[PDB]
Amino acid sequence: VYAWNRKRISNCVADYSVLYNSASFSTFKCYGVSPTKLNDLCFTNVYADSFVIRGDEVRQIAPGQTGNIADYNYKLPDDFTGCVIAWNSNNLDSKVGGNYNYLYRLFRKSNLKPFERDISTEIYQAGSTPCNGVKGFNCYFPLQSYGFQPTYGVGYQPYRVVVLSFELLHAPATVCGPKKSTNLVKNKCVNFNFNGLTGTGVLTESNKKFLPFQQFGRDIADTTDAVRDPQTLEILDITPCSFGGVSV
Amino acid sequence: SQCVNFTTRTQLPPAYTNSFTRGVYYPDKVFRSSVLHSTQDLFLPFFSNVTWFHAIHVSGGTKRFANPVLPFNDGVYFASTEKSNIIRGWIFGTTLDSKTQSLLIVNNATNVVIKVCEFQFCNDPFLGVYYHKNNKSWMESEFRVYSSANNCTFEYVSQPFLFKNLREFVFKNIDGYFKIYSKHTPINLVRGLPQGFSALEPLVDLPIGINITRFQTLHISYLTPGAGAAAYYVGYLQPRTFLLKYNENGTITDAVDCALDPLSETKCTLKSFTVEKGIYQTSNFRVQPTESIVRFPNITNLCPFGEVFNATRFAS
Amino acid sequence: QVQLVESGAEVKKPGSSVKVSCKASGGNFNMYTISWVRQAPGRGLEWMGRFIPIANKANYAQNFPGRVTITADKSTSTVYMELRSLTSDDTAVYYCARSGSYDAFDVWGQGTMVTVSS
Amino acid sequence: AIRMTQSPSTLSASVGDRVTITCRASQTINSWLAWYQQKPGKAPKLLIYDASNLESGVPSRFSGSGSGTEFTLTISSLQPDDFATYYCQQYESYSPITFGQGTRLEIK
Ligand SMILES: *[C@@H]1O[C@H](CO)[C@@H](O)[C@H](O)[C@H]1NC(C)=O
Ligand SMILES: *[C@@H]1O[C@H](CO)[C@@H](O)[C@H](O)[C@H]1NC(C)=O
Ligand SMILES: *[C@@H]1O[C@H](CO)[C@@H](O)[C@H](O)[C@H]1NC(C)=O
Ligand SMILES: *[C@@H]1O[C@H](CO)[C@@H](O)[C@H](O)[C@H]1NC(C)=O
Ligand SMILES: *[C@@H]1O[C@H](CO)[C@@H](O)[C@H](O)[C@H]1NC(C)=O
Ligand SMILES: *[C@@H]1O[C@H](CO)[C@@H](O)[C@H](O)[C@H]1NC(C)=O
């Protein structure tokens, strides 16, 4: 938790529904965005901060929280925009003799700024007398182990916490959700949506010889006349659905 | 890798030529057919003096001829005339050091590598190949371009790729997108930028989102136990309105630069490549101002704002 | 380069007790746990106990109830493993292993040959 | 106490061949398993950790696989220097840690 791993995610499609319905996540607290809407949004960057935290301190991974974790190990900003996922991994981070590989910072001069990693192991001086790198009276090692065991309490078991931080800017949008595939319908008046371009018309097979770099074709008056299906690289002519004055 | 240091460094003097009617590229991905369409974009103006320099790929003979660093401005038209693929890649950035993010594009023997990182480029980037006599084929064995590379942001690898050939490329950095256009032609000319027309098809657009002000080319070096050096040309793009002609199959077959000459102004006004005999009101002449002159009263008193914003008591 | 140096060879009699050392040189002693592994001749490795500097705790193998008592001096970064009630079957090389980073014994001591006989 | 069983206990092979060593656990130890190599007269050195990774400095010819209860150490190209006794650790329960019975590799 004091050395939480941060991974930057970009240039890919993120299927948040698949991860949502993947395992038994004891906590899926999304602040600033509903989870079900995660597939309908494009994010500039996705930061995956992964660490291990005991059960009682899981609640401390949230904006506006106070405590040893939220002040010395991992601080979430008050303007946090993203999800926090946590699942009880008692079958992987708990050992009979005690798993001491996970350490949490216990003593620090000041509370951590949001999204700050401090992996300094210098002895903390709690008294007037200097420590000079030697731990003793009024001199404490900042990091303390957890010591997870399978027989520990439910609130003392290790939870593997992954905090997804979406950089909600949408200008250099590179992480998006999955893409819908509604079956193409031809020779019928339909409301088509190709690559975000919306319109209404009748789609027919076309003999136009598109060049490979070209996506759609316009008329003399710059009205969309043909498109290319992003799924199947084929060219479809778009004709307006028939209209005309009704005279009696 | 580790940089290779050359005691002697030299650069050939620049030369100048005319761009003729090249540098025209598909402004968008919209198919069009048998239509004359006007587009205002960053184009290379026709007949626009373009600098060019020779790239030496063989030494014969202890002088290192290093390519120079040229400004990027709003976009560059880079042309290369060569027999074998001498020109291999480019480096773009502002400071070209680890202080700022820098882009490096290269097409080695294996594939195309595009990396945006805080590269620390060497003084003389080196790409060396040696002739394998047993295999009777040249194989690259030296790659010394950057001493260090840290904090990468974007990575791209295109399709793995290995009587002269002219390769034209356009590099345009707009809205955090680094758009590249390419065109490859067989050219029979020996020297000079060829005169003709050929539209440049887009190759890839990269949302690197960095600032570019300078760039430098990289050449290949043929290591030999111990004359036909390739040439390359550079022009700078400007905001211009061009009238492009799309034929039936949808490729730009011709283009009219306007604000080049009055005839070209007539052509785009008429939205035609052919103009009939007559007098056509094309544009408007206006004499732009030369100097600006401010003439305010010669008053040096300071207004008593400190007696109104610092009053001890403000009235009811 | 973390190097672990143990004590010299020890010769004892049955019914006595032995106490070997493991000087941890380099790195941070307060994070990595020191584990003692013994190997009788003609037999595979056997685990004895673990010292946990971060928690200031000592663990012993289930097969050795109260026979092993592990203490250490954090000032000098020296780990001492005490084995009690030596018998003829305890003649083995008592390595000390540093289960660092990934809980695996990446660094092993030179090993001391402890011989228990009349 | 988790018991570790190796197979084969004694194996012989020539230089450059393929060697497969199976160390099967008694309980589900996930992926926590380490492979060692103990040349006679020398302290064992780590080769594989987490049952799939390769320790720094170990030649790339060593490869490990398997998870759950059965694990496997495989040498792509056996070398004369790679003839020693290989053990498997089960660092999933620290009370007590059980090594393998020992797989001695001999020149065929
Ligand atoms: C998408 O997958 C379909 C198979 O259902 C394939 O026919 C089509 O060409 C694919 N489109 C791509 C790879 O752009
Ligand atoms: C080309 O432009 C350069 C300045 O960049 C100028 O010195 C040279 O005379 C020009 N030559 C021609 C042919 O216009
Ligand atoms: C790395 O580059 C990115 C730009 O993509 C910048 O935002 C970040 O501050 C840089 N950090 C480092 C490690 O220099
Ligand atoms: C268009 O392309 C087709 C097939 O590639 C070819 O048969 C036809 O002649 C081309 N027409 C023009 C005007 O280029
Ligand atoms: C050229 O075009 C003019 C129209 O301006 C026409 O009068 C003349 O006959 C044309 N000449 C030829 C040779 O086409
Ligand atoms: C009012 O007084 C303060 C302090 O002397 C000064 O900083 C400020 O500029 C004054 N306000 C104006 C409007 O001059």
Numbering used by the authors:
A (entry chain C): 347 to 594
B (entry chain A): 13 to 72, 75 to 176, 186 to 249, 257 to 346
C (entry chain H): 1 to 118
D (entry chain L): 1 to 108
Please, what does the article write about this entry?
S is the major surface glycoprotein on the SARS-CoV-2 virion and is involved in viral attachment to target cells via the interaction of cell-surface-expressed angiotensin-converting enzyme 2 (ACE2) with the receptor binding site, at the tip of the receptor binding domain (RBD), in the S1 fragment of S (Lan et al., 2020). Following attachment, cleavage of S releases S1, allowing a major conformational change in S2, exposing a hydrophobic loop that executes fusion of viral and host cell membranes, releasing the viral genome to initiate viral replication (Walls et al., 2017). In-depth structure-and-function analyses of 27 potent RBD-binding mAbs isolated from vaccinated volunteers following breakthrough Omicron-BA.1 infection reveals that they are focused in two main clusters within the RBD, with potent right-shoulder antibodies showing increased prevalence. In summary, we have presented a structure-function analysis of potent human antibodies induced by Omicron BA.1 breakthrough infection in SARS-CoV-2 vaccinated individuals.
As expected, these antibodies (structures obtained for Omi-31 and -38) attack the RBD from the front and sit above the binding site of Vir-S309. Changes, especially in the H3 loops, explain their differing specificities. However, there were notable exceptions; BA.2 neutralization was reduced 189-, 79-, and 26-fold compared to BA.1 for Omi-8, 32, and 33 respectively, while BA.1.1 neutralization was reduced 28- and 193-fold compared to BA.1 for Omi-6 and 32, respectively, and knocked out for Omi-38 and 39. This was not seen for other SARS-CoV-2 variants against Omi-38.
